[PDB]
Design a binder for this molecule. Structure first.
Ligand SMILES: *C(C)[C@H]1/C(=C/c2[nH]c(/C=C3N=C(/C=C4\NC(=O)C(CC)=C4C)C(C)=C\3CCC(=O)O)c(CCC(=O)O)c2C)NC(=O)[C@@H]1C
Lengths: 172, 162, 162, 172, 162, 172, 172, 162, 162, 172, 162, 172
């Protein structure tokens, strides 16, 4: 996988050149925004259990057929597995925010999930709705101003949002 | 691709856990460094011509036989010196990457892995490269945290070459 | 257990290598945080009585059936209240340890491992602890980095109980 | 294993008590001298190879029997084995200074080593001498005033000393 | 899943052996009891509506707070009660499968597996279900081998919920 | 894998229903015929080797090209593998009769066979004939009236024949 | 491991001998009392969790040093472990009653356990008291006249007791 | 060794499970069988003499070359027939053990394990033992359950020796 | 299959190394043998009908019951005679192959692997073949290294047969 | 895998016939010149490092794009990897000359190599030329008349080449 | 100690097999060469003074700086020259062991294992030894098989040094 | 392990000396007698099965208690284990003769054998008698002057017996 830093290094080494100032200044920006980045990771993690359960409750409420006898979430074993998947994706998204690159999420989580689901009969489109649920919840948690030093977090929130988007589209 | 950031997630992932206060302190340490790290990277890159050309001379001066002895693995031809300069340039470049990443990762991935192999096959003396590295180190002009992180890498290679 | 210092040496030792710039950063991150953690621990330690008894009352308040229902798992007797007061104090104390170590390590080691087994076997409702924990957080009176770190260990526990 | 922090935490937990102010304000002093701890680790590490090679040489020059054919450091396979050992001890000693506790060096390195050298026939006293040379060489490296901001860093030098001593005493 | 027949055949397979007199004795024990297992399954099924509604009420009386406190995981709303009744219906029906199979298999498949995560994630109290189970056992009306087999499955679940 | 019992169960919970009073009357019938089933399993088992041997012999006598140098069964290593294949099918077939469901026979033996024989170059059609000679032999062993309490066993014989036919058709 | 049957067979084979009529009838007597043995296993198993739970509670109520901070069952993880050891010992004891022989308990559970505790620092003597607590509770359960066709289950009851005694003995 | 009771516990143990209704059914299956299994063991034993001598002679008659051709492996000497009579006795004694245990375990333990390698190194024809077993099966005179299980073991050995 | 050459290359391959003085000596040893091996292989081939028929009669002569007793496994019919003749011929041909390869490879692959399984299922006595092999050893009329080479394989089969 | 001898035995066994005189005369000729086959092997291995070093140097000199940044052989790790590949092909080719068969070369080296290279993005056609350069170097070294008893080694020289050629065609 | 005899047995043992014609051929190859290999060892040993001293001089000749440049790794002092002489003798002696053994065993064990690590740690140039080994090959005075076996070990070392 | 040649070499290096002329000539004489050593290996090997079988019969004949029920050899499983031990020893013995050194025998066979027998209760003194009998049958087969070129292989015969004597002593 890559860092926001190793990502740039790679692109540069492919050309045998040092980093261009436009590349050095792009990273100095991510460094200065650092605290906001660290706050985003902690806020989602501190609420992970609620982000998952609530996002799951909504899903089943709008798609009852999932929990009707006949599954695919109907057994207790698969209901557990489904909850697990939601936790897994959310965990991998925080990894992306923490490193500042999607490689971690794409390379170890999303890659091959659309097909792994297809081969099992799990409704990938449903998983996409669950991921979107968590995105909104997570975004709102990150946007909350109560109990933090005020500032403009818009960049970090849009980046965060795109990772969730990648998770959705990867199984849509 | 070893860095604070990748190691924190790798360990977190291998353990199947979300990040916590531990990895956060990791990120704070990373950001407390990145600025000076990126600055040292820009500075070294800015004076690459002097550092490299100044390094090759240190080697030839110290090991004059490399410029008078004939052979595929020596710098007594125009092409011998050309490769010796590129080689030194590779070292410096990758060190700047190590500084941009805040870790030995680019060094490990692009140079170190397979270095002894290359030096033995192509009959390149590890002490030649140690001299170059020592020249770069002494002609840094770098100060503080930029000097310290940049020197840990220069010394990291020297250790690997001895 | 698990802290920035122990993970760093663990990752390095497993990889059979010396510490480098990455682990040094980890250490810098750890020391930027330490002062806050210890004062958080010192603060929670001094406010132990108030916090524990204030949290216990918050639990009995949310769930009146825990003080009026006959049973070994309930606080309907003075024996049960003392057990409940004790447990909450265990959490608070264990949390101050997390602050001293700068990681979930002491929480993992002394509390979290076996927690689910223990709650089920003795029929202790996890939500009961999820409230005392909310009380501690809403009343500790910590700010800044001390607030932020203390809350992560508290939210870490709340998440582990739900 | 523990680090300076968890060690004190373990002693306190054993008695069901919060840390005292003596324990707390003592850990505060360590935190305050952290930069020195970090510089010492970096300095030993930065001269790892030369510290080992130089001590190994001195060792063999004073004890040539080890190097005479049918000696212990004799073949090339062992001689490499011996060098590695020198690096291992030094490596683990740097881990002790980094964590602020010796448990790492004792638990994973020194534990049962004397036993190990007995069954193999490895002259443990010479191993101890090699270590002592690494001590003196390492201490001089860390006490060097050139190239760093000046201050009294004799506290962590004493701590480093105790780790090196544990190593030598565990083989002798 | 696990039953006398699958366990017997699986064990023979892992040993690469043909069935012998031992597995034949296993087969006799299963038929000697299938009759009363089925009968027990027929009676429970035919009395299901009163057993579930009766078990449901028994829990609402033992735990009045489950019906007078708003909560997604409580039954203080019409939908909540339906979820609880549905649940109690799942336990009973799944117990009838264990009687049909002559083993815990269907239970360990459709219910047991992941039962602990589900209760914890949705804040459902295991004692609620232990109660629903006891009411079911005290309202069987079952007799003989039909009673014992049915109860061994109910106590098996009661055991799993503690 | 499924038992005749758990097979019905799987059908019921997918539908979220108790077994129909009807479904219970069917299983009880298999139960009341339990002795006959135990006997057919015991009977075939007690004659495994000769079942394998005789079917093997006859197959080769009818298809000598399999025995000639260069035939599939020509060497000793492959003759052994060939006899082995034969007792495998037989053994799994008994497993099927004992559990009263073919799932053990499908998941653990047959499934994949056709493709395995293809890549290897084993005459699947020839295996099929061998298995059929085994069936004929087995059925007569099972229906022999001697030394066993008499009654109608027709139902378990055909249920036994279906398991053999499944294996037979899975190879060609 | 042995059965009550195979234990007798081993004794006769060693001597190269058919089982005497005496040893044979001694076994038919055991067989004629199988139901009781079966009920004993079912009863303990039906109350397994409460057997363990209550005994743990009683043990701790009697030896508070066990759970005060710094004691062997303090912290969560030890306690769970302690609770598991109890369930394990009780599980294996039920295996002894089922097989009608102690070897399954001595071989797979008790042998080496004493040394296990010592190396760990676990107080066997108190683990021993815990076993006695489960025994009295299990014996009381097995001996209850409520809900069972009446009879004398005293041979099997002293048999149960012998295994619990073996467990308490192996631990200290 | 393998018996209905040892297997049930071996399975539960490797699964880390308490016995349940399945193992109990297995116990009933065993205790249903034990009766006829013991009476069979008693009957074969009371007639050991006639059966061994009887079987021994059926082998010598179907294979006359074993009593007339010289060789360590044949019975053309008083000592030869002694080994043979002794062997047959072994086969019969071990069979009455399987009937006692209600499983092939004792056959597996004291006979079957290493049988082929014993018949190969000492040049004993497996067909000779098959013949002796056919004689025993055809002459023990047992009926019902005792016959069925006893023949189960005789045919097990026949299959093993072919 | 096993031969000096394939074994050499296989060992070097397992250790991922180039051939050395050792493997070259193996080749010299091979080439010292091989002419003797090909000549013996050629000589036995040209004397096949005499060796096979002779060996067969040595068998029928030493075990007369094999030509007088009815059975799928006996040579009492002309087809049974055809099989025995063919089998003896199989041993003879596969032996010439080992002489060509200079190893037991072709014996291992074509005839030894599974040999015991075949003798058991089809009730063929290893002694019949041991006798056939002995006759072949006393009648091939081989000399020198050709004989010693050939006899190592005949004795290898004999030993494998007992 | 086979050696020249087992290869022939294989063709004969599938026909169930003794080797023909044509097969025997062919193999006995190979035996007669075994000394040349021995030298050829020792001469290639004797110059193993230089054959690979010099071919690799000429290969990069001809295709500098391979070592410039961004090239396949551009990094150090991959440079070591590419060299290893050069070494492995040569080792197996000598294996083929030693056994007098190519199966060791094909089965254990070339089979599936083209697929691996494409999957990794390794310029297979570039590998083919590196292999061809080793061939010429090896051919010349083997054909060298110095320091060895004179004679015509051209039959073995031709066989060596065929193996090098199989390697080139397999990677492309 | 990789040798024809030990390797053969190690292989047969790893397969649980007795020695056979293939291993026998290996022995023949071994003894058909040990005669010249042993005589070669004797000769190299008796010419040790001139070979070692001549090689050391050939090294100092092609690498003048090794006797001029000060440094622990160089022979600019008598101490350095003595060590170098010493070093050269080790190679020669270990090569005679390879001849006595008929394989690289002695080389791999006492010299080659850990070689690269040693030359690196003490910054000794592999080219130096490569040249000493060329001087030895030039000056053996051995011929035929003795010459060819000696040269294979000398080239085996040259390879390992490149 | 060691070769007769590597045995002398190992000793030489420890002293850092070339082999003395006596050592070299001593090895020259072994090489010159190598044909005899090869024949010794082949003979025994061509006679292993009988050597083992006839040795066991003789042993049991003289010691019936080994075979009587309850005897160490009494079961078939263990009779098979006993036969195996005999083959193993003889096999390792031929290894000793083939390498001209006893290391293979003491290292992977005899080493710790005496002890595993004391733990199992296998009568070492009986095994020793067994090996003792395999020594004489072997000696007489190797001594047979028929079908071979005439010479005196007394040296090789004495060495062979010595390996046998060692194995018998390494137990009894
Ligand atoms: C001893 C602990 C107590 C006791 C035992 C006792 N039990 C029986 C008889 C039976 N027990 C069963 C048990 C089961 N049948 C089942 O289907 C299941 C579920 C799989 C179980 C556990 C059965 C079938 C019988 C026999 C039929 C019957 O109801 O009698 C007896 C009687 C005798 C006999 O040997 O059969 C006795 C004495 N009785 C006590 O008073 C002790 C407290």
């Amino acid at each position: 996988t890559f860092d926001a830093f190793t990502k740039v290094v790679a692109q540069a080494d492919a050309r045998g050149e040092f980093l261009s100032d436009a590349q050095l200044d792009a990273l100095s920006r991510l460094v200065a925004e650092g605290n906001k980045r660290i706050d985003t990771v902690n806020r989602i993690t501190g609420n992970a259990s609620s982000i998952v359960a609530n996002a799951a409750r909504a899903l089943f409420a709008e798609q009852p057929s999932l929990i009707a006898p006949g599954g695919n979430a109907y057994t207790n074993r698969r209901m557990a597995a489904c909850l697990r998947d939601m936790e897994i994706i959310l965990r991998y998204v925080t990894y992306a925010v923490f490193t500042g690159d999607a490689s971690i999420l794409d390379d170890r989580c999303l890659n091959g999930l659309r097909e792994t689901y297809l081969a099992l009969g799990v409704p990938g489109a449903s998983v996409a709705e669950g991921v979107r649920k968590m995105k909104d919840a997570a975004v709102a948690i990150v946007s909350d101003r109560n109990g933090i030093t005020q500032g403009d977090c818009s960049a970090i929130i849009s980046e965060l949002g795109s990772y969730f988007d990648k998770a959705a589209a990867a199984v849509a | 691709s070893k860095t604070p950031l990748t190691e924190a997630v790798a360990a977190a992932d291998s353990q199947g856990r979300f990040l916590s206060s531990t990895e956060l302190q990791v990120a704070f340490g990373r950001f407390r460094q990145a600025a000076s790290g990126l600055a040292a990277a820009k500075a070294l890159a800015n004076n690459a011509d002097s550092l490299v050309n100044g390094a090759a001379n240190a080697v030839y001066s110290k090991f004059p036989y490399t410029t008078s002895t004939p052979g595929n693995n020596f710098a007594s031809t125009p092409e011998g010196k050309a490769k010796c300069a590129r080689d030194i340039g590779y070292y410096l470049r990758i060190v700047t990457y190590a500084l941009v990443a805040g870790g030995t990762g680019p060094i490990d991935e692009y140079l170190l892995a397979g270095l002894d192999e290359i030096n033995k096959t192509f009959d390149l003396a590890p002490s030649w490269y140690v001299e170059a590295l020592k020249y770069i180190k002494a002609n840094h002009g770098l100060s503080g945290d930029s000097r310290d992180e940049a020197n840990s890498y220069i010394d990291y290679l020297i250790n690997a070459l001895s």
